[PDB]
PDB file of all heavy atoms in Angstrom:
ATOM      1  N   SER A  51      -1.596  -2.328  -8.532  1.00 16.11           N
ATOM      2  CA  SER A  51      -3.026  -2.535  -8.341  1.00 16.11           C
ATOM      3  C   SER A  51      -3.898  -1.868  -9.385  1.00 16.11           C
ATOM      4  O   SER A  51      -3.384  -1.345 -10.400  1.00 16.11           O
ATOM      5  CB  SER A  51      -3.470  -2.058  -6.973  1.00 16.11           C
ATOM      6  OG  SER A  51      -4.563  -2.789  -6.523  1.00 16.11           O
ATOM      7  N   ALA A  52      -5.189  -1.836  -9.119  1.00  8.63           N
ATOM      8  CA  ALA A  52      -6.179  -1.288 -10.041  1.00  8.63           C
ATOM      9  C   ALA A  52      -7.489  -1.155  -9.396  1.00  8.63           C
ATOM     10  O   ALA A  52      -7.880  -1.915  -8.374  1.00  8.63           O
ATOM     11  CB  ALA A  52      -6.392  -2.185 -11.372  1.00  8.63           C
ATOM     12  N   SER A  53      -8.376  -0.151  -9.690  1.00 13.41           N
ATOM     13  CA  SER A  53      -9.694   0.050  -9.247  1.00 13.41           C
ATOM     14  C   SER A  53     -10.474  -1.282  -9.217  1.00 13.41           C
ATOM     15  O   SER A  53     -11.394  -1.534  -8.440  1.00 13.41           O
ATOM     16  CB  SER A  53     -10.352   1.158 -10.003  1.00 13.41           C
ATOM     17  OG  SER A  53     -10.845   0.672 -11.335  1.00 13.41           O
ATOM     18  N   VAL A  54     -10.089  -2.117 -10.218  1.00 13.91           N
ATOM     19  CA  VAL A  54     -11.040  -3.182 -10.628  1.00 13.91           C
ATOM     20  C   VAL A  54     -10.637  -4.567  -9.984  1.00 13.91           C
ATOM     21  O   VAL A  54     -11.432  -5.485  -9.995  1.00 13.91           O
ATOM     22  CB  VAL A  54     -10.947  -3.364 -12.186  1.00 13.91           C
ATOM     23  CG1 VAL A  54      -9.690  -4.214 -12.582  1.00 13.91           C
ATOM     24  CG2 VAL A  54     -12.109  -4.086 -12.700  1.00 13.91           C
ATOM     25  N   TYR A  55      -9.473  -4.634  -9.267  1.00 13.42           N
ATOM     26  CA  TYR A  55      -9.064  -5.688  -8.613  1.00 13.42           C
ATOM     27  C   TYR A  55      -9.822  -5.813  -7.308  1.00 13.42           C
ATOM     28  O   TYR A  55     -10.106  -6.871  -6.836  1.00 13.42           O
ATOM     29  CB  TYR A  55      -7.559  -5.623  -8.252  1.00 13.42           C
ATOM     30  CG  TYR A  55      -6.631  -5.654  -9.525  1.00 13.42           C
ATOM     31  CD1 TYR A  55      -5.290  -5.302  -9.381  1.00 13.42           C
ATOM     32  CD2 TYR A  55      -7.200  -5.929 -10.727  1.00 13.42           C
ATOM     33  CE1 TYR A  55      -4.417  -5.287 -10.489  1.00 13.42           C
ATOM     34  CE2 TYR A  55      -6.348  -5.908 -11.883  1.00 13.42           C
ATOM     35  CZ  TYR A  55      -5.073  -5.583 -11.695  1.00 13.42           C
ATOM     36  OH  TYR A  55      -4.252  -5.498 -12.837  1.00 13.42           O
ATOM     37  N   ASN A  56     -10.221  -4.680  -6.778  1.00 10.82           N
ATOM     38  CA  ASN A  56     -11.025  -4.613  -5.477  1.00 10.82           C
ATOM     39  C   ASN A  56     -10.169  -5.145  -4.336  1.00 10.82           C
ATOM     40  O   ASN A  56     -10.697  -5.572  -3.303  1.00 10.82           O
ATOM     41  CB  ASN A  56     -12.387  -5.277  -5.560  1.00 10.82           C
ATOM     42  CG  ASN A  56     -13.326  -4.610  -6.420  1.00 10.82           C
ATOM     43  OD1 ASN A  56     -13.469  -3.367  -6.289  1.00 10.82           O
ATOM     44  ND2 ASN A  56     -14.132  -5.357  -7.169  1.00 10.82           N
ATOM     45  N   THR A  57      -8.824  -4.855  -4.417  1.00 12.55           N
ATOM     46  CA  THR A  57      -7.910  -5.210  -3.341  1.00 12.55           C
ATOM     47  C   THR A  57      -7.184  -3.953  -2.894  1.00 12.55           C
ATOM     48  O   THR A  57      -6.345  -4.166  -1.954  1.00 12.55           O
ATOM     49  CB  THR A  57      -6.788  -6.280  -4.002  1.00 12.55           C
ATOM     50  OG1 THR A  57      -6.179  -5.708  -5.101  1.00 12.55           O
ATOM     51  CG2 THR A  57      -7.438  -7.538  -4.213  1.00 12.55           C
ATOM     52  N   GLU A  58      -7.528  -2.817  -3.382  1.00 11.83           N
ATOM     53  CA  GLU A  58      -6.801  -1.538  -3.005  1.00 11.83           C
ATOM     54  C   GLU A  58      -6.904  -1.167  -1.421  1.00 11.83           C
ATOM     55  O   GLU A  58      -5.868  -0.736  -0.873  1.00 11.83           O
ATOM     56  CB  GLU A  58      -7.400  -0.372  -3.806  1.00 11.83           C
ATOM     57  CG  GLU A  58      -7.202  -0.534  -5.295  1.00 11.83           C
ATOM     58  CD  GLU A  58      -7.418   0.854  -6.014  1.00 11.83           C
ATOM     59  OE1 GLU A  58      -8.548   1.099  -6.246  1.00 11.83           O
ATOM     60  OE2 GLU A  58      -6.369   1.412  -6.303  1.00 11.83           O
ATOM     61  N   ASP A  59      -7.972  -1.405  -0.849  1.00 12.10           N
ATOM     62  CA  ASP A  59      -8.227  -1.133   0.584  1.00 12.10           C
ATOM     63  C   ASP A  59      -7.371  -2.045   1.374  1.00 12.10           C
ATOM     64  O   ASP A  59      -6.858  -1.646   2.480  1.00 12.10           O
ATOM     65  CB  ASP A  59      -9.661  -1.198   0.949  1.00 12.10           C
ATOM     66  CG  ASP A  59     -10.245  -2.538   0.643  1.00 12.10           C
ATOM     67  OD1 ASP A  59      -9.745  -3.256  -0.269  1.00 12.10           O
ATOM     68  OD2 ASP A  59     -11.230  -2.987   1.268  1.00 12.10           O
ATOM     69  N   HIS A  60      -7.195  -3.287   0.958  1.00 13.56           N
ATOM     70  CA  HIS A  60      -6.467  -4.310   1.655  1.00 13.56           C
ATOM     71  C   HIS A  60      -4.951  -4.128   1.568  1.00 13.56           C
ATOM     72  O   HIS A  60      -4.242  -4.327   2.577  1.00 13.56           O
ATOM     73  CB  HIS A  60      -6.914  -5.679   1.218  1.00 13.56           C
ATOM     74  CG  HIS A  60      -8.306  -6.045   1.522  1.00 13.56           C
ATOM     75  ND1 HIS A  60      -8.713  -6.277   2.844  1.00 13.56           N
ATOM     76  CD2 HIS A  60      -9.425  -6.315   0.657  1.00 13.56           C
ATOM     77  CE1 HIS A  60      -9.982  -6.617   2.782  1.00 13.56           C
ATOM     78  NE2 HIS A  60     -10.389  -6.684   1.507  1.00 13.56           N
ATOM     79  N   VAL A  61      -4.493  -3.764   0.467  1.00 15.27           N
ATOM     80  CA  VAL A  61      -3.030  -3.480   0.160  1.00 15.27           C
ATOM     81  C   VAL A  61      -2.567  -2.199   0.921  1.00 15.27           C
ATOM     82  O   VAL A  61      -1.501  -2.129   1.573  1.00 15.27           O
ATOM     83  CB  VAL A  61      -2.727  -3.434  -1.337  1.00 15.27           C
ATOM     84  CG1 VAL A  61      -1.254  -2.894  -1.517  1.00 15.27           C
ATOM     85  CG2 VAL A  61      -2.925  -4.658  -1.975  1.00 15.27           C
ATOM     86  N   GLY A  62      -3.479  -1.191   0.860  1.00 13.63           N
ATOM     87  CA  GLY A  62      -3.115   0.098   1.580  1.00 13.63           C
ATOM     88  C   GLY A  62      -3.076  -0.195   3.046  1.00 13.63           C
ATOM     89  O   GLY A  62      -2.172   0.321   3.804  1.00 13.63           O
ATOM     90  N   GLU A  63      -3.942  -0.926   3.705  1.00 11.48           N
ATOM     91  CA  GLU A  63      -3.914  -1.390   5.063  1.00 11.48           C
ATOM     92  C   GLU A  63      -2.621  -2.125   5.393  1.00 11.48           C
ATOM     93  O   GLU A  63      -1.944  -1.937   6.412  1.00 11.48           O
ATOM     94  CB  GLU A  63      -5.123  -2.190   5.559  1.00 11.48           C
ATOM     95  CG  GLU A  63      -5.182  -2.510   6.923  1.00 11.48           C
ATOM     96  CD  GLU A  63      -6.369  -3.551   7.308  1.00 11.48           C
ATOM     97  OE1 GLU A  63      -7.401  -3.555   6.547  1.00 11.48           O
ATOM     98  OE2 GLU A  63      -6.351  -4.138   8.416  1.00 11.48           O
ATOM     99  N   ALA A  64      -2.175  -3.110   4.565  1.00 13.61           N
ATOM    100  CA  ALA A  64      -0.915  -3.859   4.688  1.00 13.61           C
ATOM    101  C   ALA A  64       0.233  -2.818   4.682  1.00 13.61           C
ATOM    102  O   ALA A  64       1.219  -2.860   5.609  1.00 13.61           O
ATOM    103  CB  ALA A  64      -0.725  -4.837   3.648  1.00 13.61           C
ATOM    104  N   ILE A  65       0.298  -1.861   3.719  1.00 11.44           N
ATOM    105  CA  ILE A  65       1.306  -0.900   3.658  1.00 11.44           C
ATOM    106  C   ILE A  65       1.333   0.096   4.892  1.00 11.44           C
ATOM    107  O   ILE A  65       2.451   0.308   5.534  1.00 11.44           O
ATOM    108  CB  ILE A  65       1.205  -0.082   2.335  1.00 11.44           C
ATOM    109  CG1 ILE A  65       1.547  -0.951   1.101  1.00 11.44           C
ATOM    110  CG2 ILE A  65       2.003   1.262   2.375  1.00 11.44           C
ATOM    111  CD1 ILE A  65       1.043  -0.508  -0.315  1.00 11.44           C
ATOM    112  N   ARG A  66       0.172   0.505   5.309  1.00 14.12           N
ATOM    113  CA  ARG A  66       0.065   1.300   6.593  1.00 14.12           C
ATOM    114  C   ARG A  66       0.669   0.572   7.820  1.00 14.12           C
ATOM    115  O   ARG A  66       1.254   1.301   8.634  1.00 14.12           O
ATOM    116  CB  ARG A  66      -1.395   1.830   6.768  1.00 14.12           C
ATOM    117  CG  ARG A  66      -1.712   2.878   5.803  1.00 14.12           C
ATOM    118  CD  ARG A  66      -3.101   3.491   6.116  1.00 14.12           C
ATOM    119  NE  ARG A  66      -4.163   2.748   5.260  1.00 14.12           N
ATOM    120  CZ  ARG A  66      -4.998   2.001   5.754  1.00 14.12           C
ATOM    121  NH1 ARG A  66      -5.083   1.808   7.076  1.00 14.12           N
ATOM    122  NH2 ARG A  66      -5.846   1.380   5.033  1.00 14.12           N
ATOM    123  N   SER A  67       0.443  -0.734   7.949  1.00 13.19           N
ATOM    124  CA  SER A  67       0.992  -1.448   9.129  1.00 13.19           C
ATOM    125  C   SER A  67       2.459  -1.634   9.105  1.00 13.19           C
ATOM    126  O   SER A  67       3.194  -1.671  10.127  1.00 13.19           O
ATOM    127  CB  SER A  67       0.290  -2.771   9.382  1.00 13.19           C
ATOM    128  OG  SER A  67       0.688  -3.659   8.284  1.00 13.19           O
ATOM    129  N   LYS A  68       2.976  -1.715   7.908  1.00 16.66           N
ATOM    130  CA  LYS A  68       4.471  -1.888   7.586  1.00 16.66           C
ATOM    131  C   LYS A  68       5.074  -0.532   7.851  1.00 16.66           C
ATOM    132  O   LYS A  68       6.328  -0.534   8.099  1.00 16.66           O
ATOM    133  CB  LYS A  68       4.693  -2.494   6.288  1.00 16.66           C
ATOM    134  CG  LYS A  68       4.489  -3.986   6.151  1.00 16.66           C
ATOM    135  CD  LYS A  68       5.379  -4.726   7.228  1.00 16.66           C
ATOM    136  CE  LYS A  68       4.770  -6.076   7.381  1.00 16.66           C
ATOM    137  NZ  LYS A  68       5.612  -6.853   8.392  1.00 16.66           N
ATOM    138  N   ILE A  69       4.431   0.536   7.694  1.00 17.38           N
ATOM    139  CA  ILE A  69       4.850   1.883   8.072  1.00 17.38           C
ATOM    140  C   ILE A  69       4.781   2.032   9.644  1.00 17.38           C
ATOM    141  O   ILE A  69       5.753   2.523  10.193  1.00 17.38           O
ATOM    142  CB  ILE A  69       4.010   2.989   7.407  1.00 17.38           C
ATOM    143  CG1 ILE A  69       4.188   2.886   5.815  1.00 17.38           C
ATOM    144  CG2 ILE A  69       4.496   4.364   7.836  1.00 17.38           C
ATOM    145  CD1 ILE A  69       3.486   3.911   5.052  1.00 17.38           C
ATOM    146  N   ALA A  70       3.610   1.712  10.194  1.00 17.79           N
ATOM    147  CA  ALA A  70       3.320   1.910  11.527  1.00 17.79           C
ATOM    148  C   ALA A  70       4.521   1.205  12.468  1.00 17.79           C
ATOM    149  O   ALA A  70       4.843   1.744  13.439  1.00 17.79           O
ATOM    150  CB  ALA A  70       2.137   1.337  11.925  1.00 17.79           C
ATOM    151  N   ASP A  71       5.032   0.049  11.870  1.00 15.62           N
ATOM    152  CA  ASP A  71       5.961  -0.748  12.618  1.00 15.62           C
ATOM    153  C   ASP A  71       7.362  -0.519  12.219  1.00 15.62           C
ATOM    154  O   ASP A  71       8.172  -1.319  12.685  1.00 15.62           O
ATOM    155  CB  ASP A  71       5.466  -2.169  12.541  1.00 15.62           C
ATOM    156  CG  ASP A  71       5.686  -2.758  11.222  1.00 15.62           C
ATOM    157  OD1 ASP A  71       6.438  -2.129  10.319  1.00 15.62           O
ATOM    158  OD2 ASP A  71       5.124  -3.885  10.934  1.00 15.62           O
ATOM    159  N   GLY A  72       7.573   0.421  11.380  1.00 13.77           N
ATOM    160  CA  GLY A  72       8.906   0.845  11.072  1.00 13.77           C
ATOM    161  C   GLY A  72       9.710   0.119  10.000  1.00 13.77           C
ATOM    162  O   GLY A  72      10.824   0.462   9.713  1.00 13.77           O
ATOM    163  N   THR A  73       8.904  -0.669   9.309  1.00 17.83           N
ATOM    164  CA  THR A  73       9.542  -1.489   8.189  1.00 17.83           C
ATOM    165  C   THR A  73       9.842  -0.606   6.963  1.00 17.83           C
ATOM    166  O   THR A  73      10.888  -0.664   6.396  1.00 17.83           O
ATOM    167  CB  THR A  73       8.787  -2.658   7.807  1.00 17.83           C
ATOM    168  OG1 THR A  73       8.401  -3.444   9.001  1.00 17.83           O
ATOM    169  CG2 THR A  73       9.500  -3.524   6.937  1.00 17.83           C
ATOM    170  N   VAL A  74       8.892   0.260   6.550  1.00 17.60           N
ATOM    171  CA  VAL A  74       8.980   1.086   5.358  1.00 17.60           C
ATOM    172  C   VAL A  74       8.512   2.478   5.565  1.00 17.60           C
ATOM    173  O   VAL A  74       7.842   2.743   6.556  1.00 17.60           O
ATOM    174  CB  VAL A  74       8.113   0.510   4.091  1.00 17.60           C
ATOM    175  CG1 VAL A  74       8.748  -0.645   3.574  1.00 17.60           C
ATOM    176  CG2 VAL A  74       6.782   0.230   4.519  1.00 17.60           C
ATOM    177  N   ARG A  75       8.928   3.412   4.773  1.00 19.47           N
ATOM    178  CA  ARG A  75       8.219   4.735   4.802  1.00 19.47           C
ATOM    179  C   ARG A  75       7.378   4.813   3.458  1.00 19.47           C
ATOM    180  O   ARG A  75       7.581   4.153   2.537  1.00 19.47           O
ATOM    181  CB  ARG A  75       9.260   5.844   4.683  1.00 19.47           C
ATOM    182  CG  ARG A  75      10.234   5.803   5.873  1.00 19.47           C
ATOM    183  CD  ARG A  75      11.282   7.011   5.784  1.00 19.47           C
ATOM    184  NE  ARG A  75      12.035   7.039   4.462  1.00 19.47           N
ATOM    185  CZ  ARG A  75      12.152   8.089   3.695  1.00 19.47           C
ATOM    186  NH1 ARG A  75      11.430   9.198   3.877  1.00 19.47           N
ATOM    187  NH2 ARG A  75      12.866   8.027   2.614  1.00 19.47           N
ATOM    188  N   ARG A  76       6.300   5.654   3.530  1.00 17.23           N
ATOM    189  CA  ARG A  76       5.513   5.966   2.272  1.00 17.23           C
ATOM    190  C   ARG A  76       6.305   6.284   1.054  1.00 17.23           C
ATOM    191  O   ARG A  76       5.949   5.779  -0.014  1.00 17.23           O
ATOM    192  CB  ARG A  76       4.503   7.075   2.607  1.00 17.23           C
ATOM    193  CG  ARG A  76       3.487   7.412   1.423  1.00 17.23           C
ATOM    194  CD  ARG A  76       2.612   6.234   0.933  1.00 17.23           C
ATOM    195  NE  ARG A  76       1.993   6.436  -0.400  1.00 17.23           N
ATOM    196  CZ  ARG A  76       2.512   6.176  -1.612  1.00 17.23           C
ATOM    197  NH1 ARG A  76       3.629   5.497  -1.705  1.00 17.23           N
ATOM    198  NH2 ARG A  76       1.767   6.344  -2.671  1.00 17.23           N
ATOM    199  N   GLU A  77       7.308   7.070   1.228  1.00 16.23           N
ATOM    200  CA  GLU A  77       8.306   7.551   0.223  1.00 16.23           C
ATOM    201  C   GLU A  77       8.983   6.448  -0.494  1.00 16.23           C
ATOM    202  O   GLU A  77       9.443   6.697  -1.692  1.00 16.23           O
ATOM    203  CB  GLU A  77       9.240   8.609   0.801  1.00 16.23           C
ATOM    204  CG  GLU A  77       8.617   9.988   1.359  1.00 16.23           C
ATOM    205  CD  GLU A  77       7.986   9.733   2.732  1.00 16.23           C
ATOM    206  OE1 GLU A  77       7.836   8.779   3.314  1.00 16.23           O
ATOM    207  OE2 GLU A  77       7.574  10.774   3.210  1.00 16.23           O
ATOM    208  N   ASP A  78       9.276   5.308   0.184  1.00 16.65           N
ATOM    209  CA  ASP A  78       9.965   4.202  -0.356  1.00 16.65           C
ATOM    210  C   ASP A  78       9.013   3.212  -0.983  1.00 16.65           C
ATOM    211  O   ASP A  78       9.535   2.260  -1.474  1.00 16.65           O
ATOM    212  CB  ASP A  78      10.950   3.663   0.673  1.00 16.65           C
ATOM    213  CG  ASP A  78      12.008   4.638   1.076  1.00 16.65           C
ATOM    214  OD1 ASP A  78      12.608   5.453   0.142  1.00 16.65           O
ATOM    215  OD2 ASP A  78      12.345   4.601   2.248  1.00 16.65           O
ATOM    216  N   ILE A  79       7.743   3.437  -0.957  1.00 17.73           N
ATOM    217  CA  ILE A  79       6.798   2.512  -1.598  1.00 17.73           C
ATOM    218  C   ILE A  79       6.367   3.163  -2.846  1.00 17.73           C
ATOM    219  O   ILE A  79       6.051   4.325  -2.904  1.00 17.73           O
ATOM    220  CB  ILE A  79       5.570   2.064  -0.602  1.00 17.73           C
ATOM    221  CG1 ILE A  79       5.961   1.308   0.507  1.00 17.73           C
ATOM    222  CG2 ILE A  79       4.501   1.432  -1.397  1.00 17.73           C
ATOM    223  CD1 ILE A  79       6.408  -0.174   0.249  1.00 17.73           C
ATOM    224  N   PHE A  80       6.306   2.316  -3.901  1.00 16.31           N
ATOM    225  CA  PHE A  80       5.893   2.694  -5.324  1.00 16.31           C
ATOM    226  C   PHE A  80       4.506   2.043  -5.599  1.00 16.31           C
ATOM    227  O   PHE A  80       4.521   0.870  -5.687  1.00 16.31           O
ATOM    228  CB  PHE A  80       6.760   2.396  -6.376  1.00 16.31           C
ATOM    229  CG  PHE A  80       6.538   3.036  -7.745  1.00 16.31           C
ATOM    230  CD1 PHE A  80       7.171   4.233  -8.207  1.00 16.31           C
ATOM    231  CD2 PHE A  80       5.349   2.611  -8.477  1.00 16.31           C
ATOM    232  CE1 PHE A  80       6.974   4.837  -9.388  1.00 16.31           C
ATOM    233  CE2 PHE A  80       5.179   3.191  -9.770  1.00 16.31           C
ATOM    234  CZ  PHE A  80       5.858   4.350 -10.153  1.00 16.31           C
ATOM    235  N   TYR A  81       3.407   2.728  -5.327  1.00 20.16           N
ATOM    236  CA  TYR A  81       2.085   2.149  -5.559  1.00 20.16           C
ATOM    237  C   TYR A  81       1.299   2.558  -6.925  1.00 20.16           C
ATOM    238  O   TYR A  81       1.240   3.748  -7.195  1.00 20.16           O
ATOM    239  CB  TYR A  81       1.064   2.502  -4.360  1.00 20.16           C
ATOM    240  CG  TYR A  81      -0.326   1.917  -4.538  1.00 20.16           C
ATOM    241  CD1 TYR A  81      -0.653   0.665  -4.013  1.00 20.16           C
ATOM    242  CD2 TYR A  81      -1.304   2.685  -5.176  1.00 20.16           C
ATOM    243  CE1 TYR A  81      -1.941   0.145  -4.190  1.00 20.16           C
ATOM    244  CE2 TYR A  81      -2.581   2.202  -5.328  1.00 20.16           C
ATOM    245  CZ  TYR A  81      -2.865   0.873  -4.881  1.00 20.16           C
ATOM    246  OH  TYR A  81      -4.086   0.483  -5.038  1.00 20.16           O
ATOM    247  N   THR A  82       0.934   1.591  -7.727  1.00 19.63           N
ATOM    248  CA  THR A  82       0.272   1.876  -8.985  1.00 19.63           C
ATOM    249  C   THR A  82      -1.267   1.532  -8.898  1.00 19.63           C
ATOM    250  O   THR A  82      -1.652   0.437  -8.431  1.00 19.63           O
ATOM    251  CB  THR A  82       0.839   0.936 -10.159  1.00 19.63           C
ATOM    252  OG1 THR A  82       2.275   1.279 -10.222  1.00 19.63           O
ATOM    253  CG2 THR A  82       0.052   1.187 -11.470  1.00 19.63           C
ATOM    254  N   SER A  83      -2.141   2.543  -9.310  1.00 20.09           N
ATOM    255  CA  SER A  83      -3.507   2.133  -9.595  1.00 20.09           C
ATOM    256  C   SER A  83      -3.790   2.341 -11.076  1.00 20.09           C
ATOM    257  O   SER A  83      -2.941   2.852 -11.847  1.00 20.09           O
ATOM    258  CB  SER A  83      -4.362   2.888  -8.659  1.00 20.09           C
ATOM    259  OG  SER A  83      -5.761   2.394  -8.678  1.00 20.09           O
TER     260      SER A  83
END
């Protein structure tokens, strides 16, 4: 991602739900800004 895409809040929310529901851990996600 990038500050300039303006999609950061939306991707973060997707990642948080996939954590909430046991699919992934934060530690196993590599996020780029």
Side-chain angles (χ1 to χ4, degrees):
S51 205
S53 71
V54 78
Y55 301 169
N56 288 319
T57 53
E58 302 195 276
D59 58 335
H60 290 295
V61 171
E63 183 187 341
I65 289 155
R66 287 184 266 111
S67 66
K68 283 304 163 180
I69 299 181
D71 71 14
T73 311
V74 288
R75 303 181 301 125
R76 180 61 195 92
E77 294 78 357
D78 295 323
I79 293 292
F80 191 105
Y81 179 90
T82 300
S83 192

